[PDB]
Design a binder for this molecule. Structure first.
Ligand SMILES: CCCCCCCCCCCCCCCCCC(=O)OC[C@H](COP(=O)(O)OCCN)OC(=O)CCCCCCCCCCCCCCCCC
Ligand SMILES: CCCCCCCCCCCCCCCCCC(=O)OC[C@H](COP(=O)(O)OCCN)OC(=O)CCCCCCCCCCCCCCCCC
Ligand SMILES: CCCCCCCCCCCCCCCCCC(=O)OC[C@H](COP(=O)(O)OCCN)OC(=O)CCCCCCCCCCCCCCCCC
Ligand SMILES: CCCCCCCCCCCCCCCCCC(=O)OC[C@H](COP(=O)(O)OCCN)OC(=O)CCCCCCCCCCCCCCCCC
Ligand SMILES: CCCCCCCCCCCCCCCCCC(=O)OC[C@H](COP(=O)(O)OCCN)OC(=O)CCCCCCCCCCCCCCCCC
Ligand SMILES: CCCCCCCCCCCCCCCCCC(=O)OC[C@H](COP(=O)(O)OCCN)OC(=O)CCCCCCCCCCCCCCCCC
Lengths: 504, 598
């Protein structure tokens, strides 16, 4: 019942932000603020009333809330939304990141701020629709609709220091990657629907009806391959990853745009929700390939992050390595590894958001991103280098933060299933500590390597400090008490794992 | 003793307050907060020990909450306290309080005063978590926090890039050790189904009755983690470079917290090592080899802090040898005594480096016994305790207990290694003392505790660690006589070599094998060069090779192919009408031929 409003409140809020711009330039930021406040409040109300801790595992499908309304009845297509623990957790995370993105773009007094807020709101609504839709056409529709405002933000509001050609190139590369992968997913969806229609005789795009589809070994592999190509593009999985550092480099300089849609949290949800239940045998056969791709992703992202002269590109490759960890966790069939993947996903979202906000604040301080042009910034600033130190400590998997908790449940479950990939991934953890310390040493330690870092810098504002400290508190609480998060998603993870291991 | 968690909370409160103060407070207020946090932790530790001895030495458990409960994976946030935990906690809190008071006197007028005390408070809290944990994951949290605070404190003077490089090397080597420890954790949870020490000891013999390979793998990985943290073979290379930090940082690392974590890890999981005797013999062999290499390296070091680093490595090798010969009580007693005299030696070396006012090697200094008599006395008694001076030093009794454990378990080669290491220990220690010195309440407390007064304190390890095999009285007496004779002979040989005019020493040093051996042992037997060539250089080369992102270009190859194909196809649009008619007729020919063929 509240799921259509969970999707529509960002869209209506973005329309109001665009239309109420004639009342002033400081008006749409407030409208976006109560828009994401209402979205996050609805998500938290669903969390409180769902009773997710007391929910047992009853097998797929098992939805805590559902909504169904016909959209294209010729193909059996409906606006079909459903929420359980995993989707609710990701909707809560998306709403929190939307609140932080509205807060981070508070000082932008641009002439077209209303359209910026509309694009941000539509990206967030598309992400929530990705997390809520259990109709294959609707899921694909949200998965592709979250790309046009992202493209226009990167292309027209982007990194003003770089040329417009570089921003247009990065935005076009991101759009081509995501849309071509989505078209491959749409081909897989259409073939699955047609196979189900040939087997039974009913036009349906419903995820619940497509779970039981009699399929030959080789057609299921192809459909799983199409789904995996889409998710692997947006995971990112090597070699389909470079769009992410190019999009992070040429994103708008506020940093809110980095938290809005470029943070990856939908592809692993799609892998857990759709790739494993719809194609369990094909995923079981593809598991060595995906796990070795995750190993290569971890090592390649770590070596990429160490070899970066740009801090934003370094954080992007950190995201690549962490998502390789999550990809290893997904193709294991372990409940412990799945819960660790959920915790790692939430913790990576929080820590990457903190790192991107701090990098943006550093960029409005010193007007450069080259780590060769900065150094010894610990003595020049008040709050920023210590918070960046904490977030770099978080991203290397230090205990006390949720990143360690998630990645260590991942490695526990993986070693219960596969030992060799687990030990190579833990050497990837060594590599993670290496690049985190390298970025810390090149950015805030040493002497001033240029003249812009030689003089004192203005302190961070109270609002940016408050939201960064909120991220710090959330990461520490997730590290020291992840139990509410583990209890929220225990039923959905159990259903997905039981379907994956009881059908192979 | 229900306030067992206050020993963590008070250093945590101090760390949070001194971090969020950001140095805006006065130095008196920051010193009060930090030293008072550690002192309140030490006072709560003393009350805990009083209640522990009043209750008859009962293992107490305080479960705060549950960390993570996913199916059978149940990891709890529970603190435990037995004799070993009480001994480690008392050593950590007391020596940390003494070092905190000395640092409050020492670091006056230095930028980052509050940051320094916050980092040391977090260090103390992390090690109290390490020594109070009841399972391996909470001990891993304390382990990694101890490593993180070591990184933050070694590179404290962040302006010098050498300190940052030293801190990064220390963190990377200890992170490799923590990865080995994580392997041990994964194997132990996969086999036994739990990470609590008591439960792992209980269900280890019932589970490994059929096969006993994964337990040797787990104990080998535990040994790898221990030698990662305790700076032993083969992960010992970080300590000498990590000497770039401040003096109280060095005292807190080498004496109280950092290097003793591996010894505590081996002593805590002693049952699993008891069921894997080959791994325990490997622990003893690693300790013997590490103490021998550390003594040989300390023989030729030209700096006081480097000599103290390799002396710390040699002493930790003695502890590992004691653990390998099933002399657990000897190992923990030597941990206490070594913490005492190594803290005293490091604080005295900091006094020396304040008096000298410049970074100088030991040869430039000379005749310092008259300018600083109190510092000379502190160095003399710290060297006497380190070199195991008989009947006046606690290190003598600790080393005698270690060697008696080596006797009583039938280990002869480890005994020979221990005696040789004691001989060169006296040799390098009094070599440093005679080169440097010839040519205050924490100091008083460590002055007293480095003597036999420290040997009067015994750890209450009965009922926690197994009691050692008992040596005969005559064998014990002749072993004590041999140890004292070896130590006295080494000290007298150092006096014959370095007290007078150096002619025999310089003749050995000026020999060509003298150059070869001095350069070999000065660089820690080439292990640093070996790890630079085998690991650091290919890492840098692969990073430089991959910095262009080859996979991105490989996936951009279709865009280049599309551009080339479009440019090739646009040549047909030359705008000539006759060519358009010719192309239409060519297509007619192709369509007709294709229809005729098919
Ligand atoms: C790993 C194998 C298995 C998985 C395969 C997954 C395939 C789908 C996901 C990956 C898609 C890769 C797309 C690669 C091109 C992305 C866009 C790009 O890089 O554009 C660069 C360039 C524009 O920028 P610039 O260099 O400034 O050029 C200005 C020229 N005046 O662009 C241009 O100048 C021209 C751009 C033309 C349009 C893009 C190219 C499309 C080619 C077909 C894509 C479909 C996949 C085909 C198979 C790919 C290899 C397996
Ligand atoms: C773009 C290049 C073409 C990609 C699609 C290739 C399709 C193909 O070759 O299919 C052959 C076969 C069809 O499946 P088949 O075994 O006939 O099923 C009935 C009995 N199992 O398919 C199979 O047997 C399974 C083949 C799986 C791998 C094919 C796709 C690889 C893509 C790499 C990128
Ligand atoms: C112990 C022997 C037994 C084997 C056990 C496992 C291996 C343990 C090896 C430990 C070696 C640790 C070496 C650490 C050196 C760190 C110091 C250093 O080299 O610093 C230089 C540089 C500084 O970093 P940067 O921030 O760029 O500095 C700015 C200006 N210099 O720093 C850099 O540029 C970064 C250097 C990164 C080094 C990464 C090391 C990775 C180790 C992977 C271990 C794999 C184990 C398995 C191997 C295969 C076994 C079959
Ligand atoms: C590793 C260090 C030692 C641990 C302490 C510090 C950890 C970090 C502090 C921030 C995060 C705290 C997270 C936990 C807060 C308390 C809530 C809690 O744990 O509730 C659980 C339990 C009551 O629920 P129960 O059902 O018994 O749970 C067991 C599962 N069935 O609750 C209870 O039974 C009562 C537990 C009370 C614990 C109070 C701890 C206060 C710590 C203050 C620290 C101040 C500094 C924080 C930052 C430090 C640096 C990171
Ligand atoms: C838990 C027991 C121990 C067990 C092992 C735990 C291991 C992991 C622990 C991680 C803790 C964070 C470590 C890394 C960040 C350290 C930040 C730092 O250096 O803070 C010092 C700095 C003040 O230093 P100063 O140089 O004087 O100030 C600069 C101004 N010119 O301070 C500042 O500038 C202000 C503070 C910056 C952030 C400090 C750390 C934040 C995270 C911990 C507290 C979180 C909040 C407490 C409540 C949690 C929820 C209940
Ligand atoms: C008795 C052998 C050990 C003592 C000795 O002779 O050491 C000499 C040399 C180290 O002495 P060192 O302090 O470097 O030189 C002072 C004068 N320049 O040590 C060496 O050069 C190595 C001697 C190895 C002997 C075997």
């Amino acid at each position: 019942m509240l799921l259509p409003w969970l999707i529509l409140i960002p869209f209506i809020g973005g329309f109001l932000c665009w239309q109420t711009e004639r009342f002033g330039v400081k008006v749409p930021r407030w409208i976006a603020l109560i828009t994401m406040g209402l979205t996050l409040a609805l998500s938290l109300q669903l969390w409180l009333q769902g009773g997710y801790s007391l929910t047992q595992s009853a097998g797929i499908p098992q939805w805590q809330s559902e909504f169904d309304m016909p959209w294209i009845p010729r193909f059996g297509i409906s606006i079909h939304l459903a929420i359980d623990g995993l989707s609710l957790l990701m909707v809560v995370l998306t709403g929190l990141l939307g609140v932080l993105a509205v807060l981070c773009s508070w000082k932008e007094i641009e002439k077209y701020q209303g359209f910026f807020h509309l694009n941000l709101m539509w990206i967030l609504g598309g992400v929530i629709g990705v997390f809520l839709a259990i109709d294959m056409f609707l899921f694909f529709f949200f998965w592709e609709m979250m790309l046009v405002p992202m493209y226009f933000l990167i292309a027209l509001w982007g990194h003003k220091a770089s040329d417009g050609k570089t921003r247009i190139t990065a935005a076009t590369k991101f759009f081509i990657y995501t849309q071509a992968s989505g078209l491959v997913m749409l081909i897989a969806i259409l073939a699955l629907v047609f196979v189900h229609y040939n087997a039974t005789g009913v036009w349906t795009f419903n995820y619940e009806e497509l779970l039981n589809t009699p399929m030959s070994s080789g057609v299921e592999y192809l459909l799983m391959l199409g789904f995996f190509i889409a998710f692997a593009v947006k995971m990112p999985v090597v070699p389909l990853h470079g769009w992410l550092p190019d999009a992070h480099s040429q994103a708008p300089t506020a940093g809110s745009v980095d938290l809005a849609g470029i943070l990856l949290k939908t592809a692993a949800y799609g892998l857990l929700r759709f790739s494993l239940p719809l194609f369990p045998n094909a995923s079981a056969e593809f598991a060595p390939i995906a796990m070795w791709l995750g190993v290569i992703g971890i090592f390649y992202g770590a070596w990429m992050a160490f070899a970066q002269t740009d801090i934003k590109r370094l954080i992007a490759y950190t995201s690549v390595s962490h998502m390789g960890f999550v990809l290893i966790a997904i193709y294991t069939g372990s409940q412990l590894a799945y819960q660790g993947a959920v915790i790692q996903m939430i913790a990576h979202g929080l820590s990457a958001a903190g790192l991107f906000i701090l990098c943006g604040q550093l960029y409005e301080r010193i007007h450069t991103r080259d780590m060769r042009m900065m150094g010894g910034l610990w003595s020049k600033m008040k709050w920023l280098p210590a918070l960046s130190l904490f977030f770099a400590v978080a991203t290397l998997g230090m205990p006390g933060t949720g990143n360690f908790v998630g990645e260590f449940m991942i490695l526990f479950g993986s070693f219960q299933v596969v030992p060799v990939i687990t030990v190579i991934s833990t050497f990837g953890l060594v590599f993670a500590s290496v690049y985190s310390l390298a970025m810390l040493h090149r950015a805030y330690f040493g002497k001033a390597k240029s003249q812009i870092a030689s003089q004192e810098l203005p302190g961070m504002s109270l609002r940016e400090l408050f939201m960064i400290l909120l991220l710090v508190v959330l990461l520490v609480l997730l590290g020291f008490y992840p139990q509410p998060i583990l209890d929220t998603s225990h039923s959905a993870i159990g259903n997905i794992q039981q379907w994956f291991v009881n059908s192979v | 003793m229900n306030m067992l968690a206050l020993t963590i909370i008070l250093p945590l409160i101090g760390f949070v307050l001194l971090a969020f103060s950001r140095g805006r407070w006065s130095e008196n207020v920051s010193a009060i907060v930090g030293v008072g946090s550690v002192g309140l932790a030490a006072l709560v530790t003393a009350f805990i020990g009083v209640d522990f001895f009043a209750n008859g030495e009962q293992t107490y458990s305080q479960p705060l909450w549950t960390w993570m409960s996913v199916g059978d994976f149940n990891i709890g946030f529970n603190l435990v306290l037995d004799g070993l935990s009480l001994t480690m906690l008392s050593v950590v809190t007391g020596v940390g309080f003494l070092i905190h008071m000395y640092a409050s006197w020492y670091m006056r007028g230095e930028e980052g005063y509050s940051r320094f005390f916050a980092y040391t408070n977090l260090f103390i809290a992390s090690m109290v978590v390490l020594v109070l944990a009841d399972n391996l994951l909470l001990m891993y949290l304390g382990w990694e926090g101890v490593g993180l605070c070591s990184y933050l404190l070694i590179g404290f003077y962040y302006t010098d890039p050498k300190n940052g490089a030293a801190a990064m090397k220390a963190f990377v080597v200890t992170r490799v050790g923590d990865v080995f420890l994580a392997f041990a954790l994964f194997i132990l949870y996969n086999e036994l189904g739990t990470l609590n020490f008591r439960e792992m000891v209980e269900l280890a013999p019932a589970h490994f009755a059929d096969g006993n390979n994964m337990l040797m793998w787990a104990t080998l990985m535990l040994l790898g983690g221990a030698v990662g943290k305790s700076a032993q073979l083969p992960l010992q290379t970080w300590l000498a470079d990590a000497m770039a930090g401040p003096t109280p940082v060095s005292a807190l690392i080498h004496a109280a917290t950092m290097v003793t974590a591996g010894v505590y890890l081996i002593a805590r999981t002693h049952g699993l090592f008891l069921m894997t005797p080959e791994v325990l013999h490997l622990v003893g062999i690693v300790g013997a080899v590490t103490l021998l290499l550390a003594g040989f390296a300390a023989l030729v070091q030209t700096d006081i802090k480097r000599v103290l680093a390799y002396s710390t490595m040699s002493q930790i090798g003695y502890m590992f040898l004691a653990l390998g010969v099933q002399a657990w009580d000897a190992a923990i007693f030597h941990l206490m005594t070594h913490a005492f005299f190594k803290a005293l030696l490091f604080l005295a070396s900091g006094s020396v480096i304040l008096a000298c006012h410049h970074e100088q090697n030991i040869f430039k200094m000379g005749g310092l016994r008259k300018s600083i008599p109190l510092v000379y006395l502190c160095f003399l008694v710290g060297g006497a305790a380190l070199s195991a001076l008989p009947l006046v030093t606690a290190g003598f009794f600790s080393k005698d207990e270690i060697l008696a454990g080596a006797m009583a378990n039938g280990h002869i080669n480890l005994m020979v290694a221990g005696l040789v290491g004691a001989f060169m220990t006296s040799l390098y220690t009094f070599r440093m003392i005679f080169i440097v010195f010839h040519g205050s309440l924490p100091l008083i407390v460590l002055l007293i505790l480095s003597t036999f007064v420290g040997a009067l304190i015994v750890p209450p390890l009965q009922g926690v660690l197994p009691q050692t095999t008992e040596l005969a009285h005559g064998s014990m007496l002749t072993l004590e006589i041999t140890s004292g004779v070896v130590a006295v002979v080494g000290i007298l040989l150092a006096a014959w070599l370095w007290l007078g005019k150096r002619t025999l020493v310089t003749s050995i040093a000026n020999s060509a094998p003298g150059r070869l051996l001095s350069t070999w042992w000065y660089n820690a037997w080439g292990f640093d060069w070996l790890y630079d060539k085998v690991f650091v250089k290919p890492f840098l080369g692969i990073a430089w090779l991959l910095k262009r992102d080859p996979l991105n270009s490989m996936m951009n190859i279709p865009a280049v192919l599309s551009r080339f194909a479009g440019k090739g196809l646009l040549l047909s649009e030359n705008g000539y009408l006759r060519w358009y008619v010719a192309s239409m007729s060519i297509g007619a020919v192709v369509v007709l031929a294709l229809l005729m063929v098919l």
